[PDB]
A paper describes a structure:
The type VI secretion system (T6SS) is a contractile injection machine widely distributed among Gram-negative bacteria. Bacteria use the T6SS to directly deliver effectors into bacteria or eukaryotic cells (Cianfanelli et al., 2016). The T6SS sheath comprises two proteins, TssB (VipA/IglA) and TssC (VipB/IglB), which form tubular structures similar to the T4 phage gp18 sheath (Leiman et al., 2009, Lossi et al., 2013, Clemens et al., 2015, Kudryashev et al., 2015). Upon sheath contraction the T6SS fires Hcp/VgrG and bound toxins and is subsequently recycled by the AAA+ ATPase ClpV, which binds the contracted sheath to disassemble it (Kapitein et al., 2013, Kube et al., 2014).
Here, we report the atomic structure of the TssB1C1 sheath encoded by the H1-T6SS cluster from P. aeruginosa. The 3D structure of TssB1C1 was obtained at 3.3 Å resolution using helical reconstruction within RELION (He and Scheres, 2017). The final 3D model of the 13-fold symmetric TssB1C1 sheath has a helical rise and twist of 20.2 Å and 27.7°, respectively, and presents a right-handed six-start helical assembly composed of discrete densities corresponding to the heterodimers. Side and cut-away views of the reconstruction show the 13-mer sheath as being composed of non-planar discs, each comprising 6.5 heterodimers for every 360° turn of the sheath due to a 3.36 Å axial rise difference between units. Since 12- and 13-fold symmetries are present, and given that all known contractile systems have 12-fold symmetry, we assume the 13-fold symmetry of the TssB1C1 sheath is due to sample preparation. The TssB1C1 heterodimer within the helical assembly of the sheath forms an intricate packing arrangement that is organized in three domains (domains 1, 2, and 3). Two β strands of [name] (β11 and β12) are joined by two donor β strands, one from a neighboring [name] subunit (β13) within the same protofilament and the other from an adjacent [name] subunit (β1) in a different protofilament, but within the same disc, to form a β sheet interaction (handshake interaction) at the inner layer of the sheath (domain 1). Two α helices (residues D117–L133 of [name] and S66–M86 of [name]) and a third α helix (residues E39–E54 of [name]) form a tri-helical bundle (domain 3; Figure 2Biii). This third α helix is in an extended conformation in our TssB1C1 sheath, radiating away from its originating heterodimer and interacting with an adjacent heterodimer directly below that belongs to a different protofilament, but is positioned within the same stile of the helical assembly. Our structure reveals key features for T6SS sheaths such as the extended [name] N-terminal α helix that forms an inter-protofilament tri-helical bundle at the outer layer of the contracted sheath.
Residue numbers in the entry:
A (entry chain B): 90 to 498
B (entry chain A), F (entry chain a): 4 to 135
C (entry chain P): 295 to 396
D (entry chain P): 192 to 242
E (entry chain b): 90 to 242
G (entry chain b): 346 to 498
H (entry chain P): 448 to 498
I (entry chain M): 4 to 69
């Protein structure tokens, strides 16, 4: 009990203290247990989902209200497994978060892998085989959904605080030892890593105005200053407890990002840690045309969904304020076309560094159509091409006597 | 917001009417729209009262300023039985309500449980006794 | 009186100085000799800019001196941001008293 | 232009001795208590008032 | 105890007597124990660091104040090892000293080398190997920082 | 600072108005800005009172003039048990507060501890006794 | 000094002692371009950081006093360019002794840029090249029958 | 002289003699408001030495 | 690592804000990556105990010191 | 494998590890079936880790 | 080539998440591999051919 509450308030405190809050950044907390959230979201399901305490708060009072706050990103602070109740909760929160354009971020329980530790993550040979069984039928049905791209999951949870003791973090009230002998993971205070992702999102917004860069080692997905608990061991000694629960190899990392997780992996022998990539829960479907497959892959990545969500907030507010102004199809075309075009950097697209983070779009295209049988109502389509981010690279090195490109020709 | 100079202009105008208006070529002021992050979490686990019904909880703004006021207002508490290592016996039922972020520290934990409070006070009286 | 215009009413050396302020020096513990601030409290440059953003005209007192000054004159109006930087400039100029006097 | 002094009560203070206490002054004026104040500053006729 | 206090006042006296003080040179002392400094700098960390007793004194009242003293150089008079608390204290004092442009100067404890003497400094073959172990992970993470160039030892 | 001659000049000017003004071709006076060095140290270790809370301690200017006044004002003290070599027994608890830089010398240390004060006075009375 | 310490080493058989070099705690990162590596090494040395810190104090005070004066981009360029240029000795850079200590900069370069969407606010960059200090020297002595530079050619 | 430049656009009111509408565009002398300085210790000057 | 001067700059900025930033024209710091040589050999031939199971032996750094 | 885990996963595959450089066998390999198997496997590992 | 594999592994692993096009990757890889090549001194060099 004390570890659960301590981890909750300790994670929330990490999110609060590490965030630079001002007029632009706010943090609103709702205290609701996972059973209460699943209960109230279970009361309203199917048709009645539009009416819920959670949907009222998240959508009506803010994104739906005139002159409200579109609510940005949402952070779950819960551990979701493949169980029926957690699949229901994720389905519903994906409906809400999809309606309000507010990506949902939470942590994936160690029980998703049929594990219960995250200390055993290195044991299985193939993680993709875990999710094949009929036990996960509900999980697979969730990932196939189109509303699941609004849900991220960060499996490993980072260390909240350094264990009390004379050597580290002395209490100074009385001589105190926290025990916490090497590993076993039950003695340490573990904060949810949805909060590290959250801190990364708030940081990204504070610096760049957008949530576009919340991933990568050097691209802004770094989690620094992690408590490093060093305890002596046999022989040479001096081995430290990993800040995230376990070390994830690049193969494990890519294998988890394929399964729709956001791993937090810890750099070896350092207190540094990072999110290599942000992949939503949605499994992007393959298509015949490679362009459709590309568009299907972009939608599954949170870095882009934050961009489009932000444009949804902006468009909502500015159009809501433009209601009642004299507008034709051509007038709306010029106003939307010239409004979207100030977030695009046209001339400097190849040569730029930070402005690519501040201007999230490489190009923008608007198609406006007036609804027939009605004045003043229009339909619009926004085609916006984001700045691509390096995802992976396969290199084949070749020892060559005569260069095939130039020397040999 | 139609400066009173415009009221003087349109309503009863002097022959010489001098107004000041800000020059904006393209108008179109910025949308603003700050970034809010709503957070949902399990807090005040096992409360002592019915607490509050859903839809009445709302979302409360939090920051570094009101954080401790958010704990003290929310009254997070914990109640459970724990084995008593002090004097044999058996499970020791402790009731703790944390009113500040410092109340999760082991010192404050000891000060809140009444028995550990008596022992800790004993230690401060003896350690304060050995020094003058 | 000096320039024929109210254009320079701000700045330390640009004519926004308030001089000759009464300096009340009272003894305190140890070394003593600390004076009551002529303006009610000392405002740091961060506080100053933060007040000028909120549409105030702070009078800040130079430390250890009877001198004091108005660093900037900003009217109560919050200038609105615009797409064009030129329109934003014109919107900022209107919120500053030194120009509105002109 | 109208020139006057801003009361210490604008900050929810009543001293001006406490001006160093708050961490952020821009947060003070966000509350709905100041709705009238913000509506005043947004006006186009308020550029004639210094404080 | 007497050696610690004697060394403190004796060092401060050395600094005072060997300095030619006038209008240009000043020396301002703040008596704060290393536990109190680490405590008050621990209360305000992350966002709240801009508000601290130490940051108020060092930056607001002098470098931030109108017509104040930008405070020049700062001298720690403390022995910092690679321990978690000392890495935190150095991180924070590097933030403050970096903000006010006032290099922080202090002494490195003999325990940084896993030594505790400075009489054993000749024993190890390679000092660069000492700082490789994970014990120093916090130390290396500190030296890699961009705010640490304001701290001499 | 606009010499009163300028007041006479601009306000009601005689036909012959003679002012004196310093000639500076390029103006731009020097910035001054002395070099201050702030020092942080552990002083008055283990004080007898609560002393002072943080943020109320400030930084106090020090120099060769007030140095002893800074010690006497700060009241650095030391209290600990030490083995008593004078007459068997055991630990001897001594309380010392140093009011001057000379109080760290072994003579003043002996004068502050009351027992060593009695012994030192005995020695001065005997050595002063052997000489007339 | 490679590990970011400032050793005080004692000269043998004498009461003299000295600081051979002042290196901050920061480990300067290597870069591809040797110029970037040089700039990264300069920042880690306290002798230079004291210079830039002092210029920060001066600039703070003088600009804070210049707030409210009529200034364009060109006016700020001339005032900052001509203000930084009195701490630089241009003609005597190779031949000087004590003035190199009094004038810390061998050269100075200012780039002023006006903030768009706002009057009276500017962004500036000060590129100041300090006087280098001898850090180390590797000498290879060669016993030579015919001088390779002049005799052999 | 408070103005760095001045521009006048005069327009006669249609449907009336002797009545005119005018617009005065006057550019004031800017005043230093703030300055952010980033000092850089540089081995080879980027403007001239390095090129 | 975003110097506290940047925090002061972006968060509540004085009218005069002075920061120091290292000048790197092309950035791109070196990769480092020391050369390690793993050695496998038969040691403690015919031990007296079960010794240790595989995958628990690891690789132990060796040098002239240890 | 225990050997592939150590050589590849914990170092060349790990984030911020040591790619392990060169490997030294310290064994005497003949054409026997077991030594051909051992060389085949160590060639797979060493080929995977570029060591 | 093994050493280049180690380098490429580490540096690309650290570059994951940065905005990159085909042309950007071409310039970064092309200019990264080109600092281990000595173009002008290929025929006349001694130790640098080893480095």
């Amino acid at each position: 009990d004390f570890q659960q509450l301590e981890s909750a308030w300790r994670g929330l405190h990490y999110l609060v203290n590490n965030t630079e809050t001002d007029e632009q950044l706010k943090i609103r907390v709702l205290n609701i247990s996972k059973p209460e959230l699943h209960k109230t979201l279970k009361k309203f399901k199917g048709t009645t989902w539009d009416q819920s305490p959670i949907f009222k708060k998240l959508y009506e009072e803010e994104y739906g209200q005139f002159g409200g706050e579109p609510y940005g990103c949402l952070v779950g602070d819960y551990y979701f497994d493949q169980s029926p109740p957690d699949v229901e909760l994720l389905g519903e929160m994906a409906k809400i978060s999809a309606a309000m354009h507010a990506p949902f971020i939470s942590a994936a329980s160690p029980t998703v892998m049929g594990m219960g530790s995250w200390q055993e993550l290195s044991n299985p040979r193939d993680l993709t085989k875990i999710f094949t069984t009929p036990e996960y039928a509900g999980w697979r049905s969730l990932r196939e959904s189109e509303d699941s791209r609004y849900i991220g999951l960060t499996m490993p949870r980072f260390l909240a605080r350094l264990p009390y003791g004379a050597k580290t973090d002395p209490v100074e009230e009385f001589a105190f030892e926290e025990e916490t002998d090497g590993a076993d993971s039950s003695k340490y205070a573990w904060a949810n890593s949805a909060y590290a992702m959250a801190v990364n999102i708030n940081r990204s917004f504070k610096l760049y105005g957008w949530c576009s860069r919340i991933r990568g080692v050097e691209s802004g997905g770094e989690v620094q200053g992690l408590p490093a608990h060093t305890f002596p061991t046999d022989d040479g000694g001096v081995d430290m407890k990993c800040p995230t629960e376990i070390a994830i190899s690049d193969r494990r990392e890519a294998e988890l990002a394929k399964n729709g997780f956001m791993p937090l992996l810890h750099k070896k022998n350092t207190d540094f840690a990072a999110f290599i990539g942000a992949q939503s829960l949605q499994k992007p479907a393959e298509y015949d045309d490679p362009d459709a497959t590309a568009n299907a892959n972009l939608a599954a990545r949170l870095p882009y969904l934050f961009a489009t969500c932000r444009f949804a907030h902006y468009l909502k507010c500015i159009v809501r304020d433009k209601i009642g102004s004299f507008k034709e199809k051509d007038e709306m075309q010029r106003w939307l076309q010239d409004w979207i075009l100030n977030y695009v950097d046209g001339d400097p697209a190849h040569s730029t560094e930070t402005t690519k983070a501040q201007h999230p779009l490489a190009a923008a295209e608007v198609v406006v159509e007036e609804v027939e049988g009605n004045p003043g109502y229009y339909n619009s389509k926004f085609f916006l091409r984001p700045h691509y981010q390096l995802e992976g690279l396969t290199v084949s090195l070749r020892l060559v006597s005569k260069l095939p490109s130039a020397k040999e020709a | 917001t139609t400066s009173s100079q415009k009221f003087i202009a349109r309503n009863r105008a002097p022959r010489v009417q001098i107004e000041y208006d800000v020059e904006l070529y393209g108008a179109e002021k910025k949308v603003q729209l700050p970034f809010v992050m709503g957070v949902m979490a399990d807090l005040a686990g096992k409360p002592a009262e019915p607490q509050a019904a859903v839809a009445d909880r709302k979302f409360l703004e939090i920051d570094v300023d009101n954080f401790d006021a958010r704990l003290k207002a929310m009254k997070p508490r914990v109640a459970f039985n724990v084995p008593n290592v002090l004097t044999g016996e058996g499970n020791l039922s402790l009731d703790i309500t944390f009113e500040s972020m410092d109340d999760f520290s082991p010192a404050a934990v000891a000060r809140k449980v009444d028995s550990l409070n008596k022992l800790l006070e004993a230690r401060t009286q003896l350690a304060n006794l050995l020094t003058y």
